[PDB]
Amino acid sequence: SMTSHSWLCDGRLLCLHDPSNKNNWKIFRECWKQGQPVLVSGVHKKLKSELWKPEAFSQEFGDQDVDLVNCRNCAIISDVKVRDFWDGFEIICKRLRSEDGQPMVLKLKDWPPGEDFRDMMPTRFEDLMENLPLPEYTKRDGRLNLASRLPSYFVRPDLGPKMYNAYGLITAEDRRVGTTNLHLDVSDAVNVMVYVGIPIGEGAHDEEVLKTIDEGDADEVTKERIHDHKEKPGALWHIYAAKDAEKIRELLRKVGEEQGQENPPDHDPIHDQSWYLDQTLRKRLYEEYGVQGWAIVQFLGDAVFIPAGAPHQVHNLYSCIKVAEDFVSPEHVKHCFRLT
Numbered sequence: 376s377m378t379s380h381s382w383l384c385d386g387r388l389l390c391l392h393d394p395s396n397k398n399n400w401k402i403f404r405e406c407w408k409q410g411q412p413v414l415v416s417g418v419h420k421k422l423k424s425e426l427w428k429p430e431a432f433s434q435e436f437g438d439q440d441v442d443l444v445n446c447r448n449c450a451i452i453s454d455v456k457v458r459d460f461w462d463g464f465e466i467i468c469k470r471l472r473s474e475d476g477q478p479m480v481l482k483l484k485d486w487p488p489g490e491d492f493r494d495m496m497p498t499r500f501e502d503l504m505e506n507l508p509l510p511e512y513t514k515r516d517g518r519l520n521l522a523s524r525l526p527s528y529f530v531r532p533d534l535g536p537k538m539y540n541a542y543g544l545i546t547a548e549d550r551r552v553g554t555t556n557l558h559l560d561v562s563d564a565v566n567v568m569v570y571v572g573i574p575i576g577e578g579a580h581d582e583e584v585l586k587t588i589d590e591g592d593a594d595e596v597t598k599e600r601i602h603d604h605k606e607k608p609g610a611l612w613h614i615y616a617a618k619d620a621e622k623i624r625e626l627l628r629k630v631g632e633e634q635g636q637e638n639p640p641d642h643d644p645i646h647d648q649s650w651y652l653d654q655t656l657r658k659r660l661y662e663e664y665g666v667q668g669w670a671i672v673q674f675l676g677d678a679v680f681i682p683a684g685a686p687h688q689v690h691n692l693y694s695c696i697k698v699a700e701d702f703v704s705p706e707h708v709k710h711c712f713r714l715t
């Protein structure tokens with residue numbers, strides 16, 4: 376039976392089922408006021424699927440110059456053509472190779488660059504912005520988006536959206552690396568999975584993906600979305616409450632010191648964007664500091680709502696295209712104020 380919502384993370388995460396329902400705010404706003412993330416499924420069914428394919432991005436934009444990041448070691452690959460990234464998205468035998476001769480796991484850095492998404496891709500911009508869930512919060516002019524209404528005493532988000540494109544992490548060693556390291560934003564964000572690419576050439580890679588989700592602490596209902604409904608999983612997220620950010624900074628100062636980093640006692644390991652919390656570090660955070668997070672698997676068409684101030688990290692299971700929009704809800708406006 377079609378239902379308004381369900382729960383993940385053993386009751387700790389709201390999952391809304393219908394992305395465009397005018398009644399969603401009534402369920403959403405109580406969870407949001409408490410500083411919880413929220414998942415909305417089914418956004419892919421609202422979009423024009425032909426606009427969100429890796430082959431179309433290569434054909435239309437392939438001659439642009441870009442930088443890539445090697446996710447395994449954080450090395451920058453400078454001034455290559457964007458087709459060198461897109462043509463290897465799903466076909467492993469076409470990927471740029473490291474010196475060891477392996478195909479690299481790559482992230483496309485800042486593309487489209489800065490605020491240029493709308494100018495470069497006007498049909499994509501329209502398709503995304505018209506189908507975002509919770510539109511009074513997420514649209515540039517929504518009644519509960521304060522972004523366009525605040526004075527300079529508040530940090531205002533840039534004009535979006537922003538596109539986040541990266542290969543899937545593959546090996547047992549890759550389980551300890553992030554696609555995007557632990558960081559926080561002073562604005563709220565909605566992040567939509569518009570495409571998941573399951574590769575070929577080393578296709579048969581299904582078992583390291585299950586072990587990553589299991590060791591990632593994903594709940595039993597999340598696991599049933601794969602085995603029972605055959606949905607395509609894109610990325611594993613860990614999100615922490617804004618109120619736990621300083622305890623996470625204390626853990627990462629102690630670990631920085633154990634590993635022989637030499638940091639001033641006030642330095643900010645979350646702002647540095649240099650850490651990925653692996654199974655060892657997540658268990659340490661829980662046992663030693665009393666901090667629990669939310670382990671979230673984002674499937675094709677899932678929109679993840681990330682509260683302002685909430686530390687979070689992302690680990691791609693397969694090749695992903697994500698599009699995100701920042702906004703300023705009244706619930707969380709304290710996080711972007713420049714005083715006290």
Ligand SMILES: Nc1ccccc1Nc1ccccn1
Nearest residue numbers: 377378379392393396398399
């Ligand atoms: N998605 C949703 C959200 C809030 C309120 C109602 C719905 N819709 C619905 C449709 C059939 C049966 C029961 N609920």
Ligand SMILES: [Cl-]
Nearest residue numbers: 410617706707
């Ligand atoms: Cl808050």
Ligand SMILES: [Cl-]
Nearest residue numbers: 496497498499
């Ligand atoms: Cl376009």
Ligand SMILES: [Cl-]
Nearest residue numbers: 400509510511
């Ligand atoms: Cl709304």
Ligand SMILES: [Cl-]
Nearest residue numbers: 554555556648
């Ligand atoms: Cl990062």
Ligand SMILES: [Mn+2]
Nearest residue numbers: 558559560687
């Ligand atoms: Mn972020």
